[PDB]
Amino acid sequence: HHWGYGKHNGPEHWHKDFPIAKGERQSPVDIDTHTAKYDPSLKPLSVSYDQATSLRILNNGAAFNVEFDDSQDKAVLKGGPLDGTYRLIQFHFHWGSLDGQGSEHTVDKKKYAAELHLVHWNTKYGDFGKAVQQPDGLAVLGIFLKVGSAKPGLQKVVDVLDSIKTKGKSADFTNFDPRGLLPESLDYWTYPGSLTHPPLLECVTWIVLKEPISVSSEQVLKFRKLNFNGEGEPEELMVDNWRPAQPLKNRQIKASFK
Ligand SMILES: [Cl-]
Ligand SMILES: [Zn+2]
């Protein structure tokens, strides 16, 4: 049937319906910190989320997305390896069934408990739909989550998961400040890649932060109570919604620090 993360429709099967799965700039990848090249010409990231307006949270069957109003430059990302302004449209996570796995990108083969993706689109293209068809259409900020101390700023998200347990459910989710999910340092690694789930379009400039944020075991546990299935169907827990690392091929990973 259609794509998913199960045994018969998981990542290893995606290439049949989405040939680009075997493309030249697929994500995620393993970040070898010793082969990454420090690029002195990379500018610091500029994150302006002071005007962000969240609208709703939804379970799309693959993860849960927190959507923002992207009709104006309210929450934007610029600087770094980017040319132009990118507007935040949504953020979501990828997590595992155990604390030892869950992230998409890995650092020197190290896996984290989860990975947060803040998706932004290049305003020059007018809308997200047009942006995904361009090589420089999206900018995704990736943040690693490790299990330890609780992250107060994430609790508002955790408490609403009860209302969107099954595929298709959505709920109002206003006044959420994404700044509460960022680590102290903004040092990063960057490389050209793709979305990590179908349609797997190669339109992403990845910006992966070096510093992970910590969340408590209890917070991550709530993530694992969501369902892949729709209401009234056999219960399938939403866990391990991550894709394994892909070959780097003809690509170089640059670092903003040394
Ligand atoms: Cl993604
Ligand atoms: Zn993602």
Resolution (A): 1.8
β-partners of residue 115 are: 94, 144
| Residues at Cβ < 5 Å from ligand 1 ion | 117, 195-196
Residues 92 and 120: their CA atoms lie apart, in Å, by: 12
Residues 192 and 202: their CA atoms lie apart, in Å, by: 8
How much distance in Å is there from the Cα of 184 to the middle of ligand 1?
23
Q: Is 242 helix (H, G, I), strand (E, B) or coil?
A: coil
Q: How many residues does the chain have?
A: 258
How much distance in Å is there from the Cα of 250 to the middle of ligand 2?
22
Q: For the chain, which domains are there?
A: 1-258 (3.10.200.10)
Looking at the CA of 103, name the nearest ligand: 2
Tokens representing 101? 């796995």
How much distance in Å is there from the Cα of 195 to the middle of ligand 1?
4
Contact 85, 78 (CB under 8 A): yes
Query: In the 8-state DSSP scheme, what is residue 239?
Result: -
Residues 234 and 242: their CA atoms lie apart, in Å, by: 22
Tokens representing 219? 């917070």
> Which residues are CB-contacts of 54 (< 8 A; sequence separation ≥ 6)?
66, 67, 68, 69, 173, 174, 175, 176, 178
The residue written with tokens 């994150």 in the block is 47
Cα atoms in the 13 Å half-sphere on the side-chain side of 147: 18
Secondary structure string (H, E, C) spanning 141-191: EEEEEEECCCCHHHHHHHHHHHHHCCECCEEECCCCCHHHHCCCCCCEEEE
Looking at the CA of 200, name the nearest ligand: 1
